[PDB]
Design a protein around this ligand. Structure first.
Ligand SMILES: [Mg+2]
Ligand SMILES: [Zn+2]
Length: 333
């Protein structure tokens, strides 16, 4: 891949982020994007400050320059789609920072694992096209065919991992270059395991495995660490409903539009369109959010908090509160 220039680095370094506390659970990435005409540079600055403020890169021999190169190599590989763009992965990164440090989940992990998590947030959707795994499989796209033939259905997640590995092979953007031996292996394997675990087809089993391990005082420690990392990256990925209502609503709109574009492309392809992905059918953002809250997000956050992650109780509170607010939208319609 092409090297990062001093001009690119400087365009990020000049962003000063006045008024913003990036470590805060109420942090608003949408408001940060509007605040300049260089939203991509602000987003990179947010990531850079999060990682530096953690104190972690320094401890693992990752210089400020390599860190920022990495951030910019990641940014290059995100596309202009409505939801799975660079702002999403910076959001996931920021949210995971709150789960670790505001939610005290850092206590369950080594410093290396915290570092790997914040880094993995930035790589976990690399080169997403706004199309889900199902699109590629249903349409018999070349990547779908390769995934079927090679035995994995996680088309996107494997692709994201490939691109992460390519970014890290260049020592100028290898945030893990200061590691050796078992630590270096652990960083790569845990990053990869986490990305593969974000495939929502694996949602139920990843959750159950985490909960089984957390309830077992004799669980293998290394396995529990690994599952905690997986569940935190997953938690970040479905954390939209845990944010202040208006932030949550803006996310929901962005995802809804991405899905609608997938459904438009499925129509042109002559393949099946699910109701959720079909523009022609929906009227109700509130019912979708309530549905998602009830069947996916609230049980997930409730169960992991009760099992183990007590410090993240606010996620459950905000989901409750956001749901009540969507019920008010319905009641007054
Ligand atoms: Mg993904
Ligand atoms: Zn994601």
């Amino acid at each position: 891949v092409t090297a990062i220039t001093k001009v690119e680095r400087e365009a990020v370094l000049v962003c000063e982020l006045p008024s913003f506390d990036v470590t805060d659970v109420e942090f608003d990435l949408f408001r940060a994007r509007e605040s300049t005409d260089k939203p991509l540079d602000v987003a990179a600055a947010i990531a850079y400050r999060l990682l530096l403020g953690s104190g972690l890169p320094q401890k693992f021999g990752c210089s400020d320059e390599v860190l920022l190169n990495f951030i910019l190599q990641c940014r290059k590989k995100y596309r202009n789609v409505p939801y799975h763009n660079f702002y999403h992965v910076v959001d996931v990164c920021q949210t995971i920072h709150t789960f670790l440090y505001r939610g005290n989940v850092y206590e369950k992990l080594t410093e290396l694992e915290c570092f790997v998590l914040l880094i993995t947030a930035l790589v976990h959707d690399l080169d997403h096209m706004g199309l889900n795994n199902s699109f590629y499989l249903k349409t018999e796209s070349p990547l779908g065919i390769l995934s079927s033939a090679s035995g994995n259905t996680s088309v996107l997640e494997v692709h994201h991992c490939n691109l992460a590995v390519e970014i890290l092979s260049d020592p100028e953007s290898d945030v893990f270059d200061g590691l050796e031996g078992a630590e270096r292996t652990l960083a790569f394997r845990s990053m990869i395991d986490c990305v593969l675990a974000t495939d929502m087809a694996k949602h139920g089993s990843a959750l159950e495995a985490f909960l089984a391990s957390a309830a077992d005082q004799s669980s293998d420690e290394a396995a529990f660490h690994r599952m905690t990392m997986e569940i935190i990256l997953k938690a970040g990925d479905i954390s939209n409903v845990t944010k202040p209502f208006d932030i949550s609503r803006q996310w929901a709109m962005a995802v809804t539009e991405e899905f609608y574009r997938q459904g438009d492309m499925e129509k042109e392809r002559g393949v099946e369109v699910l109701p959720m992905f079909d523009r022609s059918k929906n009227m109700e953002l509130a019912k979708g959010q309530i549905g998602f809250i009830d069947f996916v997000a609230a049980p997930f956050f409730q169960k992991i908090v009760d099992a183990c992650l007590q410090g993240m109780q606010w996620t459950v509170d905000r989901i409750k509160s956001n749901r009540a607010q969507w019920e008010r939208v319905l009641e007054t319609r």
